[PDB]
Structures are given as structure tokens and as C-alpha cells.
Amino acid sequence: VKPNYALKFTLAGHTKAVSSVKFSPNGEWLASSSADKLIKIWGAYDGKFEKTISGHKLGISDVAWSSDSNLLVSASDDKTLKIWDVSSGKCLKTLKGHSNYVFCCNFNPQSNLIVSGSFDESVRIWDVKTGKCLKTLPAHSDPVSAVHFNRDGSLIVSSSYDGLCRIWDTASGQCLKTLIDDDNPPVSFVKFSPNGKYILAATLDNTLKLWDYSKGKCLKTYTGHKNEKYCIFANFSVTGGKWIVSGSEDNLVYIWNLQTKEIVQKLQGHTDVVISTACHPTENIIASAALENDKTIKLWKSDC
């Protein structure tokens, strides 16, 4: 079994590199963030432009949706995070506290909290209602590349250029586990599996690794792609066949069989590094976005 992802739409509009694409939990929309300081909303099924959301003073590295699809959070080079009302496009809160670029962000499932990672090497936990910083974790010794809550929001996983993956207890702010491997190459991306039992981690040695973080064992390795410079988003594709999806520095979207580790498809079309990929919550749809020499978002559809 192999998917047959085929190009459906090319979404043009960003004037600089696209940095992150995410599907709304309700599947109706795709949100994109960019170095052009804008957040754009698109129709997930027709690729139709919906609206531009603005307010950040500098480029945005990440955007994330709340569980009800009503809010977005964005992480910017301006050292802040902003919480946006999607329907109005209005900035509800500006989260201030990071002392360097904000790189990654996510809401917890309950969506009362936001987790952020910054070049300031810290991980911050924010209260959505007040915009107050609840906890500052001295998480890593280098820029924090990714932060993600697990399925029940009890845990946060963070990754850094320091070569470590750390699992944190959300309520206590304490570090539960540190994952180290080989010679500690920079960790460019991390996220929990949908069941929260595993973590998918990308390293700048052209490798993706599936970890059983509690047992501290690497179960699978995904290679063949190019990843030595950028913090490229990777995903678990679960709507059809069980795949691992990632962008690559060779301008391709890579799709591996989760179990066998074999490359099942390479999606050609982008003209620059595919920095971000996202998997649709209900349909076999992939959104992919590329850097400065491309600046577009592509929507791909598969039968499986």
C-alpha cells in the first residue's frame, strides 16, 4: 500500500518565505504564517483565500489553532506571541516576556494554556484568558525549536539546538525525561504521536526518529530526505494509511510508511525548502509550504 497524493491547489499571496501551515481542528481552514509578518487564512477544500491577519512588527515563525478553531496564537521575531480572534482578525492579547525571537507555539487540548519556545533558550507557559506568563522553564542551553502538548495536556515535549528532547510535567514545570542520542546533533523538531505514547523528533543530521520516550528507546528511523539547516515540521498522517510526513531541503515533501520506514511517496512541485507540512484532521489532504524562492502553499489529495 502506497498513497497517491496529487497536487490540487497552489496558494499564492505571501510576499516572503512561508514559515508554518496548520489545519484548523474543524478542518475548514488552513492558517499560514510568514516572514512577511502576516497570518493568512485559506479554505482547506477549495484553496480560496479567506483573510489576512496583521499586527506583528517582525516575521512570524509559527502559528497554532485553539481546539475550538476560534483562536490562533503566533510566535514572532518581535519577541512576542499574539492571540487572535479568527472571526474578527483582532489581536486579543500580546504575550510579552521572551527576551529573543519566539520560534514555536502551541495551545494545550483544553486551550486554557499556550506553550512557547524561543531563541532565549526558555520554554514559557501562558494563561490564554489573561495573557500572563504562568511559568518560565530554563529548558535548554540553546534556541528552542519546537514545543508540543500531549493528548491530555499533562506533558510538554521541547526540542533544542542543544541536542536534547525534554519531557516536562505541565502542572509542576519539572523535567521528567531528557532524551539524548548518538553525538547530540541539534534537534530541529519534536511532537507527540496522536496517542501520546511516542515522540517524533527531527535532527539536523538528515534523520527523523520515533521514540518511546518513557522507555527511552528509538523504535523507528526515517531517512533519505535532506535536513541539515532548517527546523522542518513533521507529522503523523492517520486519516488513511499510517504515514510520517515531512518537508525537506531538496524541495520535496517526503512520505514514509510508519512501520516499514520505507519512502512511499515524494511530492514534487516546490521551488525551495519545504519548511512546513500539515495533515488534514479528517481527509487525506496535505498542506505544504516553502521558503523565499517559492513563497507558496500547496494542497495535495490522496485516495489513501
Binding site: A35, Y101, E228
Partner: peptide, 9 residues
Amino acid sequence: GSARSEGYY
């Protein structure tokens, strides 16, 4: 630019 689009050095 943005920190993510700049990349690692």
C-alpha cells in the same frame, strides 16, 4: 525574515 526561515548556523 523570520527565525525559522533564516535557519541554523
